[PDB]
């Protein structure tokens, strides 16, 4: 029993840690270009903000799936019942 | 190694040296520094007044 429960804590750490690593770097890359565009044209900032939010939805999509499967493995673990 | 001791002692000792410097050391040095600048400013201005 102890192995499954112990290896489910490592699974949760990887699902949230790998997601956090990618999301942080992805917004550093996307947001940097948003500042470059805002500095070039301060007249287009209202339009650039909504376009950045369209991309932000795509960037975090799989990260949000992983963080929902990690809070499911934490509360009412699906693999404990299998054994 | 890490053991928490003497934290309050060093904290109080730092304020004592900071306020001493603020009252005694800092004001006289800036006054002496400004006097050279004022004397040189008066000298360069006086040289311009002489030509004017």
């Amino acid at each position: 029993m102890e192995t499954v429960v112990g290896l489910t804590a490592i699974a949760v750490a990887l699902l949230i840690g790998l997601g956090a690593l990618g999301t942080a770097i992805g917004f550093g890359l996307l947001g940097g270009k948003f500042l470059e565009g805002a500095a070039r044209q301060p007249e287009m900032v209202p339009m650039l903000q909504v376009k950045m939010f369209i991309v932000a939805g795509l960037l975090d999509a799989v990260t949000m799936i992983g963080v929902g499967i990690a809070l499911f493995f934490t509360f009412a673990n699906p693999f404990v019942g299998q054994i | 190694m890490n053991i928490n001791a003497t934290l309050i002692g060093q904290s109080v000792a730092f304020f004592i040296f900071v306020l001493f410097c603020m009252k005694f050391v800092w004001p006289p040095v800036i006054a002496a520094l400004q006097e050279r600048q004022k004397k040189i400013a008066d000298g360069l201005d006086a040289a311009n007044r002489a030509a004017r």
């Binding site: 500095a39 070039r40 044209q41 301060p42 007249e43 287009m44 | -």
Partner: protein, 69 residues
């Protein structure tokens, strides 16, 4: 909102007036300039420059090259 724009040749002025957008062919790629745009300098390839204004939404001028500032 509008910005003052002038198109000037070594001999005389081609255009002078207020505009809301200026579109041109830069040496590296096409551009769209609007009021408040950051300082930019570029070399222009032969082609038409398009100016936009209220009513004057398609004021087009052909240019043989030169620079945009």
């Amino acid at each position: 909102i509008t910005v003052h724009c002038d198109i000037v040749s070594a001999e005389a002025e081609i255009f002078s007036g207020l505009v809301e957008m200026v579109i041109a062919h830069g040496a590296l790629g096409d551009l769209g300039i609007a009021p408040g745009h950051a300082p930019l300098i570029t070399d222009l390839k032969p082609g038409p420059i398009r100016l936009v204004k209220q009513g004057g939404e398609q004021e087009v001028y052909y240019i043989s090259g030169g620079f945009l500032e």
